[PDB]
Design a protein around this ligand. Structure first.
Ligand SMILES: Nc1nc2c(ccn2CC(=O)Nc2ccncc2Cl)c(=O)[nH]1
Ligand SMILES: Nc1nc2c(ccn2CC(=O)Nc2ccncc2Cl)c(=O)[nH]1
Ligand SMILES: [Cl-]
Ligand SMILES: [Cl-]
Lengths: 122, 122
């Protein structure tokens, strides 16, 4: 019976992206081959089964640096990180495979399913 | 031109609320009279001009405890914290004044405007 604010969650996520853009309260660096990306672990955990499983473990919860698998494409990772913080997924014919494989590794199943639809549409 | 995931932001916020419920990566305690509430500073900053202005300042960014003004009603604060993490605002005839005054202090203008509409509707 509570009053629903239909743009509140989008507003929150937009503001979290602003904080990331300013490096405010970012608490991890994700290293992907020669590139580095800062983020909030809470957002990563909210959006990825890989990051959820890492940081939920009390053994790895306080890690400040995560080295991803060396074969992960940094562009694919960057597209997915941007998706996490914007709800918008930059899928293109030139990047679909990289994005889909990276989403599999990150355990982002709805994104993988959407990549499977993009392939079905060419 | 990117693909829009229309429930992504709501899903993120729901997962952040799950993390709060488990005290995972919470980084502040808000003390309101005799009560204490743990939260993520990033979500507080995203939702309140008071918390934004506090934690953006490099002098107070690493504070782990914030004592709110002693006159703030803890119930009003709890309703607003729940709103921050759910997009749902528990406004009732028995709590409207407390919620509205607390939202003013937290600098949550859209919520204050909604409290002004609730009053206009009785
Ligand atoms: N395994 C897997 N995890 C995923 C997605 C999408 C998102 N997450 C993460 C997720 O659910 N996090 C979460 C769950 C429960 N409480 C708190 C949190 Cl932060 C997916 O497709 N697969
Ligand atoms: N003063 C004031 N602040 C508010 C609201 C609602 C939300 N916020 C906070 C906010 O905008 N945070 C923000 C802004 C820019 N970049 C990052 C972040 Cl986290 C309000 O009504 N008034
Ligand atoms: Cl910081
Ligand atoms: Cl923790």
């Amino acid at each position: 019976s509570q009053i629903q604010f239909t743009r509140h969650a989008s507003d929150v996520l937009l503001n979290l992206n602003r904080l990331r853009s300013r490096d405010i309260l970012t608490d991890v660096v994700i290293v992907v081959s020669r590139e580095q990306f800062r983020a909030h672990k809470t957002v990563l955990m909210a959006c990825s089964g890989l990051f959820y499983s890492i940081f939920t473990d009390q053994l790895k919860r306080n890690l400040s640096v995560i080295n991803l698998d060396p074969e992960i494409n940094p562009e694919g990772f960057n597209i997915l990180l941007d998706f996490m913080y914007t709800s918008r997924l930059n899928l293109r014919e030139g990047n679909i495979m990289a994005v889909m494989a990276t989403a599999m590794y990150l355990q982002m199943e709805h994104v993988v399913d959407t990549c499977r639809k993009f392939i079905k549409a060419s």
